[PDB]
């Protein structure tokens, strides 16, 4: 709660959907009404929604927090049915954004005891996985058209093992896991590099240099991670000049991972940067290679491309 | 308390126990050699070692003697520090394992009881 | 069908955790009394009656067999949770996977210290037994000192060698996806490491070495790969030919 | 009433933890089966409904507003528990206070890392 | 636990006793960072009182955060500033203890009834560093700060 | 597993049968069919079972994993009935092996759960103590004889305070701890001498002599263990007279605790030894004294009585 | 009988822990609501009404007495558990036996520092 799901998905609609050629569907499920009003009015401004004619490229379906359980448990299906139509009756690439699909599962638990059922673990209904499966299996590309679905998924009390999130994992092809622990440091998006995965992250797909850079980043981060708590007590003085040297780059990589979002300008107090894949790979490649060992960690915090961290490094003089 | 937490702390504090243990052994070896060279030489984090000399701080012959005594002392100190620190870690591991098992048992019971209550109210 | 007709079958149940959720669902809706994690009392009996059907038939019953590789997904490392606890007791052993090894570079993320096979050598060829026994002992030694690594700024040559073998062997355990190798190729690459030939090669290179060395023996030394099978083990000849190959090759590799 | 007549009102709900306890009592006495922590399944909805009623109206509707400051009491400082997280997931941010900061002399005992505003600088003057 | 937890909202002053303190020999076993009062306000107890009480609580909380480190490496890695807090906090903890008349049998000391002014004074002085030269045990089980001194002398 | 458990059981059978007349019963609670057949065929080859002539000393009761919980909860009782016959009708001292007691509790839990009962702490049945005590009390020494029970214990989550194990602790008198570390030192049986304990290890029961020897061995072994550190680091060169004797003696005792099992013969190619309680006490008593210090370690390794240690020595020179 | 007839008795309850589990078996089989460690809410009364019966009568009621030495088994020295604290809150002190002292050969393994006796001094002999 409060780690960035919505900001991140807003960023995605901003980049991917604004340039998307085809229709888009957004289903607000069990979320804030104010956010609905925020989004609606922002889309009218960008022209994504046009009230004066037939250029609108996004349909909206809402069933927020102020509604009763029956509504919140069915909206997602409402949003999904609209999208399905575009898919089958057109084949056109449809984008589907759902915030937050956990509310379909929470709504069910809400009426579960009145339906007569013995509770299952952690209070959930016994039909959780079946209920979730008959829905999620409709949210899919088929041979007829393709749907690129983005689902924000709430994690009760921050526990990723809770029945709800834990059952949602197998329904996805790429998962972006957010951590309050990271967000608490000021790193945003609060993505966990050691917990986010993707089916297409394979050398025979993203290619070798992409694959190796990614694998190298996670390794240097997992090394550091396991030392943190240790040197926290013992001290850094025993780390060899080679070890302590990796701790430096880990830290920079950690910060280079942040990125000012266009959408989050009201919170960062920074102008949104957007970085192309190739420049992304180069920035990280370079850091791993010891290149920017001479720059200060803070140079890396909250910038776009690697060149901005070099610049910032200079500005840091005074 | 939290199973996640305790587990993490135990992984850390178990590492520390071994590292500290090894540093006791290295110090012990170094001190042994030094001790041997102690008398001969007298003819011509390391505990509170650094602390002591510094707090009170406010050719050849002397240099050689001073340094010889100092190394022996240092490695002695460090050996003791590590010995105590690995000992502290062990006791703390044991105390955390207990706490992990108490929490573990209560959690299981608590989720059990919620399930039964909700079944019996039907 | 294969097991009873002199054939051999392999069955993978991916996952048994989900079969158990499905069963639990029906059990709770039928209003059967729930238990730990709301599972029914006979949930163990669900899996047991399943896994036991896996079996090695005697010659009088055709000698066929059914091997089974059930999958279980744990939550945040909880091997003592209910379904895991049950399937761990029903089976002959486990191959434990860890997130932490995965991101460190160890893939498959198998944990060598915790995985087990109660059957062990009974189902392992002599050649593999030979090299595997040395590697299992070396890695075991490595595990004990492995922590002192990054802080042992004066480790003695003895413990310092344990470390080097340990990193070398871990690197030879890494293996790319969708590339299952034959047993003769496995002994050959393990041989390299357990015989100390790679003790000088820098760890970061061991992965590139193995791939080059393996592709080379596959091509020019087929006859040595077949011999490793025939002899059942590493013959005295194979043992000298391998020494010539890896030494020369290594030398070329670091030219 | 203020909200819908172009005035502005602020409401403090001190505290919603006790309110959820009273609901749990009433629900349990009505013979509704207990869920997580004995609280009824719709405890989220009990607070959710409530808090959505605090809003900013547009000019066509009078431009009045209702701002809310619900208060939640944690136990032993766990913001990651059921109820707490229920309410955090409703509001537009949270001010987390802590006894450790409080005793160190950091009063108000605000924990900057865990506290947030989902409105940001849009709620500040240009000066601030 | 539901019972105690619900009971806190019904009080104006709370005294939370601790098993870990009592086991250290401290009596009364009061937890100086968990017992509060609605009167603990500068306009009610006066600024001198309020300040000293906030001073003691800050040094106890500071000591408490250092305990995570102390536990493994001990005090050898503490700054000289840190050690200073550790010495005074330990003198504050013991000086909070007090022989009760009703517990004479278990403490083996006469009872003490210390007047407020004398309580402020002693704590102020410990905060100021005035007794940084007395040994900790001197401050254990006494009444007014003066007895801490007398006990110190006896120890020599 | 892999610590010589099936071999120890097989010896105990054979050893109690030779020296006491009484048979053994093996109760397989939630036996895996695979391991069952293996334990069967291994029994046949060891001779503890004979598929031909009535020399069989062990009766097997198997409650397999595929069976419903009621069956697996009852099997220790069926095996208990068989054992009871040899006690109450033949006046023998029966040996009852329960493998393993944890699976008897779990079957208990599963049964109660299907019966619709509210579970107790950590999930176990409400009747956990009683279910346990009604089966265990049948295991005693009566006027006609006795049943002694060797029962394999699994400790859940490694937690000794788990209701399951803490319940079973109430009824045990002794524990035999088998360790892979010791196995690895080639010490067979792989019995850890410091962890294995016994209640009847009181002078008032096993006598003052037996007690003092036992304590002497346990002590010499604890001291040695401690010395290890110094030996390696400060070097095993500055050990005083008293210090080097401990290390040498300790190692003789340690190696003298190995013993060729009569059942091992089939593979070891060495005649199994059954050591009488007198030779054991005397044997270690003398080592402690130092009477055999003038012998090489390997003299005590895998022998029988103390006599065989000297013998072997002379031969090994 | 002894206590009320001018005579002195001593009863030893070995142990109350095992009693508390049998009562828990009865309670769960009656379907009484489980709480801490799945024990019923009256486990405190179970021991309190029992131990209150051990007392010292004054001369007008015959001067007899009944002394009780209830026994409780802890798990890994956890004297803060439900049952242990319960009996601690009933009795007049405790004699702690540490697993550490025992195993180290100290017998009887009493932890003098944690053992207490709330009302025993007055009854201790002047010689002592
Ligand atoms: N990318 C970001 N950059 C800066 N701050 C962010 C970012 N994402 C989230 N936040 C901060 O954290 C708060 C919580 O964000 P939000 O997306 O609404 O949470 P949720 O994960 O609950 O959907 C935001 O209002 C903002 O203050
Ligand atoms: Mg959101």
What is the spatial distance between Cα D119 and Cα D127, in angstroms, rounded to a whole number?
17
Q: Are A92 and A23 a contacting pair, CB within 8 Å? A: yes
Nominal resolution (angstroms): 2.6
What is the spatial distance between Cα G28 and Cα A303, in angstroms, rounded to a whole number?
62
Q: How far is CA G89 from CA C73, E26, E133, F241, G13, in A?
A: 45, 20, 42, 56, 16
Nearest of B46, B41, B32, B40 to residue B68 by alpha carbon: B41
Helix or strand or coil: residue G51?
helix
Q: Of B114, B117, B121, which is closest to D31 when you measure between CB atoms?
A: B121
Q: Is the Cβ pair C150, A166 closer than 8 Å? A: no
| Angle E44-E46-E52 from CA coordinates, rounded to 5° | 120
Give the ligand 1 atom nearest the CA of A3.
21
C/A Cβ contact: 3+ pairs below 8 Å: yes
Run of H or E residues at D22: helix D16-29
Find, in chain A, the residue whose alpha carbon is nearest to that of D40.
A110
Q: Are F202 and F211 a contacting pair, CB within 8 Å? A: yes
Residues that constitute the known binding site of F = 2-7, 31-32
Q: Is the Cβ pair F159, B25 closer than 8 Å? A: no
Run of H or E residues at C10: strand C8-13
Run of H or E residues at C243: helix C236-253
What is the spatial distance between Cα A308 and Cα A300, in angstroms, rounded to a whole number?
8
Q: Are E28 and E100 a contacting pair, CB within 8 Å? A: yes
Q: Is the Cβ pair B111, A121 closer than 8 Å? A: yes
Structural tokens at position A18 = 């604004």
Nearest of G56, G51, G53, G25 to residue G38 by alpha carbon: G25
Task: Tell me which of D80, D88, D117, D118 to substitute to probe ligand 1's pocket, judged by most ligand atoms within 8 Å of the beta carbon.
Answer: D118
Nearest of C37, D42, C15, C29 to residue A126 by alpha carbon: C29
Using the mean position of ligand 1's atoms as its centre, give its distance from the Cα of residue D113 in Å.
Answer: 12
Give the ligand 1 atom nearest the CA of A7.
17
Query: CATH: 3.50.50.60, 3.40.50.300, 1.10.1140.10, 3.40.710.10. Which one for F201-317?
Result: 1.10.1140.10
Chain A with chain D: Cβ pairs closer than 8 A: 74
Nearest of D85, D22, D18, D16 to residue D51 by alpha carbon: D16
Using the mean position of ligand 2's atoms as its centre, give its distance from the Cα of residue A18 in Å.
Answer: 20
What is the spatial distance between Cα F287 and Cα F256, in angstroms, rounded to a whole number?
9
Q: Is B117 on the interface with D (CB under 8 A)?
A: yes
Residue nearest to atom 26 of ligand 1 (CA): D118
Q: Is B7 on the interface with C (CB under 8 A)?
A: yes
Find, in chain F, the residue whose alpha carbon is nearest to that of C158.
F232
What is the spatial distance between Cα A101 and Cα A138, in angstroms, rounded to a whole number?
13
- F-chain CB neighbours of B32 within 8 Å are 233-235
What is the spatial distance between Cα E8 and Cα C195, in angstroms, rounded to a whole number?
70
Nearest of C193, C192, C205, C204 to residue C253 by alpha carbon: C205
Q: Is B3 on the interface with G (CB under 8 A)?
A: no
Give counts: helices (H), strands (E), chain A.
14, 6
What is the spatial distance between Cα D27 and Cα D39, in angstroms, rounded to a whole number?
8
Contacts with E114 (C-beta within 8 Å, 6 or more apart), sequence order: E98, E143, E144
Residue nearest to atom 8 of ligand 1 (CA): A4
Q: Is B16 on the interface with A (CB under 8 A)?
A: yes
Q: Count of alpha carbons within 13 Å of C114, Cβ hemisphere only?
A: 12
Q: Which bound ligand lies closest to the C-alpha atom of A32?
A: 2
Q: Are A22 and A92 a contacting pair, CB within 8 Å? A: yes
Look at the domain A201-318 and name its fold.
1.10.1140
Residue nearest to atom 16 of ligand 1 (CA): A4
Look at the domain E40-156 and name its fold.
1.10.1140
E/F Cβ contact: 3+ pairs below 8 Å: no
Nearest of C204, C202, C161, C208 to residue C189 by alpha carbon: C208
Q: How far is CA A4 from CA A261, A263, A302, in A?
A: 11, 11, 16
Q: How far is CA B100 from CA A140, C93, E20, G99, in A?
A: 43, 26, 19, 20
Residues with CB under 5 A from ligand 2 (ion): A 6
Using the mean position of ligand 1's atoms as its centre, give its distance from the Cα of residue D121 in Å.
Answer: 13
Q: Is the Cβ pair G22, F130 closer than 8 Å? A: yes
Structural tokens at position F169 = 């602790």
Residue nearest to atom 10 of ligand 1 (CA): A4
Sign of the four-CA dihedral F136, F137, F140, F144: negative
Structural tokens at position G1 = 């009988």
Using the mean position of ligand 1's atoms as its centre, give its distance from the Cα of residue F154 in Å.
Answer: 48
Instruction: Say if residue C11 is preceded by a cis peptide, omega within 30 of 0.
Output: no
Q: Are A13 and A25 a contacting pair, CB within 8 Å? A: no
What is the spatial distance between Cα D19 and Cα D10, in angstroms, rounded to a whole number?
19
Q: Are E61 and B29 a contacting pair, CB within 8 Å? A: no
Q: Is the Cβ pair C35, F69 closer than 8 Å? A: no
Q: Is D59 annotated as a binding residue?
A: no
Active site (annotated) includes residue F5: yes
Instruction: List ligand 1's pocket residues with C-beta within 6 A.
Output: A 1-7, 188-189, 261, 264, 267-268; D 116-118, 120
Burial of D58 (0-12, 13-18, 19+ CB in 10 A): exposed
Q: Is B115 on the interface with A (CB under 8 A)?
A: yes
Q: Is B99 on the interface with E (CB under 8 A)?
A: no
Structural tokens at position A85 = 């139509």
Q: Is the Cβ pair C104, A130 closer than 8 Å? A: no
What is the phi/psi pair of residue A25, to 5°?
-130, 135
What is the spatial distance between Cα A37 and Cα A153, in angstroms, rounded to a whole number?
21
User: Which residues of D lie closer than 8 Å to A, measured between beta carbons?
Assistant: 32-33, 35-36, 40-42, 44-45, 48-49, 51-53, 55-56, 80-82, 85, 88-90, 92-94, 113-114, 116-122
Q: Is the Cβ pair B16, E72 closer than 8 Å? A: yes
DSSP string across chain E: -HHHHHHHTT-SB---B-HHHHHTT-SS-B-TTT--BTT-STTTT-HHHHHHHHHHHHHHHHHHHHHHHHHHH-GGG--HHHHHHHHHHHHHHHHT----GGGHHHH-S------HHHHHHHHHHHHHTTTTTS-GGGGSS-SSHHHHHHHHHHH-
DSSP symbol at G110: B
| Angle F128-F132-F138 from CA coordinates, rounded to 5° | 160
Bridge-partner residues for F175, per DSSP? F197
- A-chain CB neighbours of E73 within 8 Å are 233
Nearest of F191, F192, F193, F215 to residue F203 by alpha carbon: F215
User: Which residues of E lie closer than 8 Å to A, measured between beta carbons?
Assistant: 69, 72-73, 77
Sign of the four-CA dihedral F112, F118, F120, F126: negative
- D-chain CB neighbours of B117 within 8 Å are 33-34, 38
Q: Is the Cβ pair A180, D35 closer than 8 Å? A: no
DSSP symbol at C220: H
Q: Is C82 on the interface with B (CB under 8 A)?
A: no
Q: Are C65 and C9 a contacting pair, CB within 8 Å? A: yes
Q: Of B98, B106, B113, which is closest to G34 when you measure between CB atoms?
A: B113
Q: Are F203 and F211 a contacting pair, CB within 8 Å? A: yes
**Domain C125-255, CATH homologous superfamily name and number:** ATP synthase alpha/beta chain, C-terminal domain (1.20.150.20)
How are beta strands A174-175 and A197-198 bridged, if at all?
Answer: antiparallel
Nearest of E63, E43, E42 to residue E53 by alpha carbon: E42
Active site (annotated) includes residue F241: no
What is the spatial distance between Cα A194 and Cα A257, in angstroms, rounded to a whole number?
12
Residue nearest to atom 24 of ligand 1 (CA): D118
Q: How far is CA F77 from CA A172, F59, F80, F84, G69, in A?
A: 51, 14, 5, 10, 37
Using the mean position of ligand 2's atoms as its centre, give its distance from the Cα of residue A65 in Å.
Answer: 12
CB atoms within 10 A of CB F89: 10
Instruction: Say if residue E113 is preceded by a cis peptide, omega within 30 of 0.
Output: no
**Domain F1-200, CATH homologous superfamily name and number:** P-loop containing nucleotide triphosphate hydrolases (3.40.50.300)
For residue G128, the distance in angstroms to the closest alpha carbon of chain F comes to: 31
Domain with CATH 3.40.50.300 in chain A: 1-200
Q: Is the Cβ pair B113, G38 closer than 8 Å? A: yes
């Amino acid at each position: 709660a409060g780690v960035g799901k919505t900001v991140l998905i807003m960023e995605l609609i901003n980049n991917v959907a604004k340039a998307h050629g085809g229709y888009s569907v957004f289903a607000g499920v069990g979320e804030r009404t104010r956010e609905g009003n925020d989004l609606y009015h922002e889309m009218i401004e960008s022209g994504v929604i046009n009230l004066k004619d037939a250029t609108s490229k996004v349909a909206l379906v809402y069933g927020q927090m102020n509604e009763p359980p029956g509504a919140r448990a069915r909206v997602a299906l409402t949003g999904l049915t609209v999208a399905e139509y575009f898919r089958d009756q057109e084949g056109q690439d449809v984008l589907l954004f759902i915030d937050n699909i956990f509310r379909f599962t929470q709504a069910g638990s809400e009426v579960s005891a009145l339906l007569g059922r013995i509770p299952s673990a952690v209070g959930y209904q016994p039909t959780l996985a079946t209920d979730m499966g008959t829905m999620q299996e409709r949210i899919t590309t088929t041979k007829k058209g393709s749907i690129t679905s983005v689902q924000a998924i709430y994690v009760p009390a921050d526990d990723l093992t809770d029945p709800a999130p834990a059952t949602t994992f197998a329904h996805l092809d790429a998962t972006t896991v957010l951590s309050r622990a990271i967000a608490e440091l000021g790193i945003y998006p609060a993505v966990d590099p050691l917990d986010s995965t993707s089916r297409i992250m394979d050398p025979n797909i993203v290619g070798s240099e992409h694959y190796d850079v990614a694998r190298g980043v996670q390794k240097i981060l997992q090394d550091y991670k396991s030392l943190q708590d240790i040197i926290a007590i013992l001290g850094m003085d025993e780390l060899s000049e080679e070890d302590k040297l990796t701790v430096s780059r880990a830290r920079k990589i950690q910060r280079f991972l942040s990125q000012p979002f266009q959408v989050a300008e009201v919170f960062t107090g920074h102008l949104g940067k957007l970085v192309p894949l190739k420049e992304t790979i180069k920035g990280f490649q370079q850091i791993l290679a010891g290149e920017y060992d001479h720059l200060p960690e803070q140079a890396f915090y909250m910038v776009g491309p690697i060149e901005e961290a070099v610049a910032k490094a200079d500005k840091l003089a005074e | 308390a939290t199973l996640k937490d305790i587990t993490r702390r135990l992984k850390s504090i178990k590492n520390i126990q071994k590292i500290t243990k090894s540093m006791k052994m290295v110090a012990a070896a170094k001190y042994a050699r030094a001790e041997r060279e102690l008398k001969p030489a007298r003819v011509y984090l390391c505990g509170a070692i650094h602390s002591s000399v510094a707090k009170q701080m406010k050719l050849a012959n002397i240099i050689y003697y001073s340094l010889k005594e100092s190394t022996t002392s240092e490695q002695s100190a460090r050996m003791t520090a590590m010995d105590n620190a690995s000992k502290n870690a062990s006791e703390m591991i044991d105390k955390l394992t207990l706490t992990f098992n108490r929490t573990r048992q209560a959690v299981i019971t608590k989720e059990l009881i919620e399930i039964i209550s909700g079944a019996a109210a039907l | 069908y294969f097991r009873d007709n002199g054939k051999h079958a392999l069955i993978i149940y991916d996952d048994l955790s989900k079969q158990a959720v499905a069963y639990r669902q029906m059990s709770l809706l039928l209003r059967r009394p729930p238990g730990r994690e709301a599972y029914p009392g006979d949930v163990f009996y669900l899996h047991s009656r399943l896994l036991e059907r896996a079996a090695k038939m005697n010659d009088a019953f055709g000698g066929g067999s059914l091997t089974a590789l059930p999958v279980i997904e744990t939550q945040a490392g909880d091997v003592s949770a209910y379904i895991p606890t049950n399937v761990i007791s029903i089976t002959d052993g486990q191959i434990f996977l860890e997130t932490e090894l995965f991101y460190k570079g160890i893939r498959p993320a198998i944990n060598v210290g915790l995985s087990v096979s109660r059957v062990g050598s009974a189902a392992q060829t002599r050649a593999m037994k030979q090299v595997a026994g040395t590697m299992k002992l070396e890695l075991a030694q490595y595990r004990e000192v492995a922590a002192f690594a990054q802080f042992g700024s004066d480790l003695d040559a003895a413990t310092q060698q344990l470390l080097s073998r340990g990193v070398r062997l871990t690197e030879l355990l890494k293996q790319g996806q969708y590339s299952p190798m034959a047993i003769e190729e496995q002994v050959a690459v393990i041989y390299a490491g357990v015989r100390g030939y790679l003790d000088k090669l820098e760890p970061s290179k061991i992965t590139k070495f193995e791939n080059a060395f393996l592709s080379h023996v596959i091509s020019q030394h087929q006859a040595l790969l077949g011999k490793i099978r025939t002899d059942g083990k590493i013959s005295e000849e194979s043992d000298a030919k391998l020494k010539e190959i890896v030494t020369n090759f290594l030398a070329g590799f670091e030219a």
